[PDB]
Design a protein around this ligand. Structure first.
Ligand code: GSL
Ligand SMILES: *[C@@H]1O[C@H](CO)[C@@H](O[C@@H]2O[C@H](CO)[C@@H](O)[C@H](O)[C@H]2NC(C)=O)[C@H](O)[C@H]1NC(C)=O
Ligand code: PLM
Ligand code: NAG
Ligand code: NAG
Lengths: 265, 97
């Protein structure tokens, strides 16, 4: 599981800026924090994890001060349109192991990370960042706080989320599939489409088949989100008209027990 | 600066006359400022819900719009996007097939 906190800050000029944040645990949103809101909003029953109200309030306060300081520091540095994104969190591995990260992009490009005990520019980042990053590193209060958040608080908080959020994280939702076709660009050919929607979790197997034989022309699309915390995917096959007979789409998913969906064209 | 990609798809198998949900998934764009409309027969659908703006590992932004709809033999549905990266709004039509 990758836990990520995403910050999106836009500065249009000296007197217009906003920052919005969202937080994900794998593919499930756990928090939102609008520019218009003083406080971080929960998007799950279990968004506080195992933290007490006191621990949560202390954490939220730290972020409230950060959001204000960050905006002031950027407007100060700029002495437009500027887009800054920050992605921070941790990847949780089997056996209580984790790895934390904090990356920053400027104008859509990765330029800075926090690594170990300091802020570092990435090779290729513009040279004008070297000095402000130096100055930032002089702020040992901030460096120590970031170290604690990354090394300590992040994995601790996520362990709690994983417990508290068990019934959602471990949910199984069954795919429903259906078949369609369109003419292809190419006289006498058709594109067959197998649509698979409503499944959770994400891992799925979808193949066009002729009997036991996988059709290697099967072209899987991207995973597309539904609005109800389930997934959508389609897989297409270009066929010569005539050759359509005998084809099936087969889908395997954890929620199906061990009974694959097979639809026949 | 990156141009939005748009994909339009239904939550459930479409059946004419049966209520469903139409999704418009907009991806790969930068900057995050975007306008997304969903249209029925060329007219704006008033009740459209939007996900919170988020971004991927490659830093590009994405957003999911969705609306209740009931497919019909003759009604056309589309998702129309305006973004700084494009001189003209981009429209993609839902195609059940
Ligand atoms: C054209 C501009 C391009 C910029 C390019 C990118 C810039 C790199 C971005 C580097 C991040 C800037 C961090 C600055 C934050 C500090 O100003 C802030 C305030 O520091 C002051 O107050 C502190 C306090 O009261 O807590 C300390 O006392 C400190 O000594 C004092 O100087 N520091 C903090 O708020 C500390 C904790 C912040 C954690 C930073 C990571 C947050 C990421 C969380 C994920 C998303 C959250 C929305
Ligand atoms: C947070 O973890 C980082 C990464 O392990 C620590 O930075 C390391 O500190 C050790 C021990 O002093 C050094 O030997 C390494 O050089 C540092 N690692 C890297 C990759 O830079 C950091 O000290 C930890 N901070 C806290 C407060 O626990
Ligand atoms: C150095 C900052 C890195 C961020 C890691 C944060 C670890 C604490 C986890 C608390 C996350 C709760 C969501 C709040 C974050 C937000 O709203 O932006
Ligand atoms: C700053 O940007 C905002 C939002 O784009 C805009 O409304 C405002 O006119 C700008 N202010 C100035 C001084 O140009
Ligand atoms: C975002 O919130 C800040 C702090 O409350 C506020 O000053 C600013 O006007 C808000 N941004 C916008 C564009 O609404």
């Amino acid at each position: 599981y990758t836990f990520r906190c995403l910050q999106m800050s836009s500065f249009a000029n000296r007197s217009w800026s906003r920052t919005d944040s969202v937080v994900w645990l794998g593919d499930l949103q756990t928090h939102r924090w609008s520019n218009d809101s003083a406080t971080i909003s929960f998007t799950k029953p279990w968004s506080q994890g195992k933290l007490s109200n006191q621990q949560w309030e202390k954490l939220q306060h730290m972020f409230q001060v950060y959001r204000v300081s960050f905006t002031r520091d950027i407007q100060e540095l700029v002495k437009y349109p500027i887009e800054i994104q920050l992605s921070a969190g941790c990847e949780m591995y089997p056996g209580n192991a984790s790895e934390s990260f904090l990356h920053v992009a400027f104008q859509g490009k990765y330029v800075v990370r926090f690594w170990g005990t300091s802020w570092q520019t990435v090779p290729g980042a513009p040279s004008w960042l070297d000095l402000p990053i130096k100055v930032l590193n002089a702020d040992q209060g901030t460096s120590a706080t970031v170290q604690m958040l990354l090394n300590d608080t992040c994995p601790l908080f996520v362990r709690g989320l994983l417990e508290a959020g068990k019934s959602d994280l471990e949910k199984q939702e069954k795919p429903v599939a259906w078949l369609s076709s369109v003419p292809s660009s190419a006289h006498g050919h058709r594109q067959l489409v197998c649509h698979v929607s409503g499944f959770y979790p994400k891992p799925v197997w979808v193949m066009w088949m002729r009997g036991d034989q996988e059709q290697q022309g099967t072209h899987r699309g991207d995973f597309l989100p539904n609005a109800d915390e389930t997934w959508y995917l389609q897989a297409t096959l270009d066929v010569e008209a005539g050759e359509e007979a005998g084809l099936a789409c087969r889908v395997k998913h954890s929620s199906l027990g061990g009974q694959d969906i097979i639809l026949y064209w | 600066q990156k141009t939005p990609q748009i994909q339009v798809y239904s939550r459930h198998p479409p059946e004419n006359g049966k209520p469903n949900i139409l999704n418009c998934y907009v991806t790969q764009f930068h900057p995050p400022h975007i306008e997304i409309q969903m249209l029925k027969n060329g007219k704006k659908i008033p009740k459209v819900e939007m996900s919170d703006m988020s971004f991927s590992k490659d830093w590009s932004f994405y957003i999911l719009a969705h609306t209740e709809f009931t497919p019909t033999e003759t009604d056309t549905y589309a998702c129309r996007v305006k973004h700084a990266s494009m001189a003209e709004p981009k429209t993609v039509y839902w195609d059940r097939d």
